[PDB]
Amino acid sequence: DSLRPKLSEEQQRIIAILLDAHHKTYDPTYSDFCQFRPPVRVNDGGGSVTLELSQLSMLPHLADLVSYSIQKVIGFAKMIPGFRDLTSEDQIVLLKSSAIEVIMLRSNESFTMDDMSWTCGNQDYKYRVSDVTKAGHSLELIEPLIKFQVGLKKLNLHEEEHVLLMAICIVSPDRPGVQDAALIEAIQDRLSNTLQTYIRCRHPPPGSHLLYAKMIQKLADLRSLNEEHSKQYRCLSFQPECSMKLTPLVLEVFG
Ligand SMILES: C=C1/C(=C\C=C2/CCC[C@]3(C)[C@@H]([C@@H](C)CCCC(C)(C)O)CC[C@@H]23)C[C@@H](O)C[C@@H]1O
């Protein structure tokens, strides 16, 4: 039954543009991480919230990593076909509302099921759940985040699908404050059609089975993680002197 229309010339170009955009904005060697404020891991085997908030030992490093990542995501977004056709206001609304979700998606590349960490170098740049608690977050965010990373890993996405998913995540017409939802939807549909077509024509079985719907579900999971992250960030920001441990960009995007 299922027809397999071939990718159009345009669709092939969209894929190539997104792959190039990602390769220019995601360094798989994590060579810039030593430039961030250093990671510090206080002794907290008991997971004390009082101690974690008192020290926020991993916050400067993780805030720098997230801030750096937001800058890369802004650059990636600017290369998404159609993104620059949007008004500046809609572009900023889309970037601010998707930032954390795209960070969670793109981070899957360093996440490894070998030990359930984001491995970005030697021990210094190996990030574990215990590091996230040392940055002021709790299990309500961490648990679903790790579950999401593993679920995404097991989809065994082609790089083409991974970059398309990030682009679709950014160009979402259902974000609060967007003006031209119709144009945003048109841009997203062009990307979704490219993704659906790619899966049916280039993704071998059995990993291709209902893969599109699995990818769409991950976009829904991301909305939930976004909301929880926002709630936790708000509370984290109540800690006196927290602003110094963050960055101006992080403060704007999540404040
Ligand atoms: C960033 C990237 C990477 C890892 C992501 C991680 C591991 C550390 C903790 C992070 C950054 C989680 C955060 C929710 C931690 C809290 C952030 C904050 C303090 C601002 O509220 C989400 C994704 C997680 C590394 C590399 O893949 C580039 C990528 O781009």
Characterization of the model:
- It is found in: Nucleus; Cytoplasm.
- Its main location: nucleus.
- Belongs to the nuclear hormone receptor family. NR1 subfamily.
- With about 260 residues, the chain is an all-alpha fold.
- It has a single domain (about 1-255), classed as Retinoid X Receptor.
- It contains eleven helices and three strands; from the N terminus they run ααααβββααααααα.
- A three-stranded antiparallel sheet has the order 1-2-3.
- A hairpin with a 4-residue loop joins strand 1 and strand 2 (about 115-120).
- Helix 3 (about 60-80) packs across helix 4, helix 6 (about 140-155) runs antiparallel to helix 9 (about 210-235) and helix 7 (about 160-170) packs antiparallel against helix 8 (about 180-200).
- The longest helix is centred in the C-terminal third of the chain and has 26 residues, at about 210-235.
- The protein is globular.
